[PDB]
């Protein structure tokens, strides 16, 4: 039903946006071993921006990850520093949500739903490039924390909501021609 489809799409968008914003702000991306505060190596929390010291005498103490501790490597370092790919995913998800909102009012345009689909799909692609960049730059034991998996779930949900939006637009234009 239109109703159920629209509700499910709207809920999906909020979930994806919230999950990606939580993930890009929280610091439990990589449970590894390192230094909590530099002027003894212990478990560390790590995130996109700051690393934190768990299990350490200075527990809870956190320091900004030192991005930039070979232009090809400079470019990866820059992209990982200013996490444009992850942050751009949040922006695209936000823009998509605005479009789905503007479907209710200012309706009958039929092209804003397609726009929402394009934004959600594009958000997924940005998210995945972000993951690849992160995983690659974090290679220069370990384990991925719950904020990493929050990011992944955002990708999946965003793709599903994208399919729903395109399908709904198709159904609209089919009803118009029926």
């Amino acid at each position: 039903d239109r109703g159920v489809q629209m509700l499910l799409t709207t809920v999906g968008a909020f979930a994806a946006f919230s999950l990606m914003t939580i993930a890009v702000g929280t610091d439990y991306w990589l449970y590894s071993r390192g230094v909590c505060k530099t002027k003894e190596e212990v478990m560390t929390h790590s995130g996109l921006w700051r690393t934190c010291c768990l299990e350490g005498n200075f527990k809870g103490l956190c320091k900004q990850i030192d991005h930039f501790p070979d232009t090809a490597e400079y470019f990866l370092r820059a992209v990982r520093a200013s996490s444009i790919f992850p942050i751009l995913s949040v922006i695209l998800l936000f823009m998509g949500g605005l479009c789905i909102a503007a479907s209710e009012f200012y309706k009958t345009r039929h092209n804003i739903i397609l726009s929402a689909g394009i934004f959600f799909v594009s958000a997924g692609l940005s998210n995945i490039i972000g993951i690849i960049v992160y995983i690659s730059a974090n290679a220069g034991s370990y384990s991925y924390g719950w904020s990493f998996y929050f990011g992944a779930l955002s990708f999946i949900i965003a793709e599903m909501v994208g399919v729903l939006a395109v399908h709904m637009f198709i159904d609209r234009h089919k009803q118009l021609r029926a």
């Binding site: 997924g124 999946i156 994208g162 395109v166 198709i170």
Partner: protein
């Protein structure tokens, strides 16, 4: 043979490719 992250990103890529092929192939009303 392949690391865990390669497998994970293969699944992500599979979802992304499938979704994009669905979109580009069946969104234009000028082919329905």
């Amino acid at each position: 043979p392949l690391a865990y992250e390669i497998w994970m990103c293969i699944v992500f890529a599979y979802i992304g490719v499938s979704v994009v092929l669905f979109l580009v192939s069946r969104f234009s009303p000028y082919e329905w």
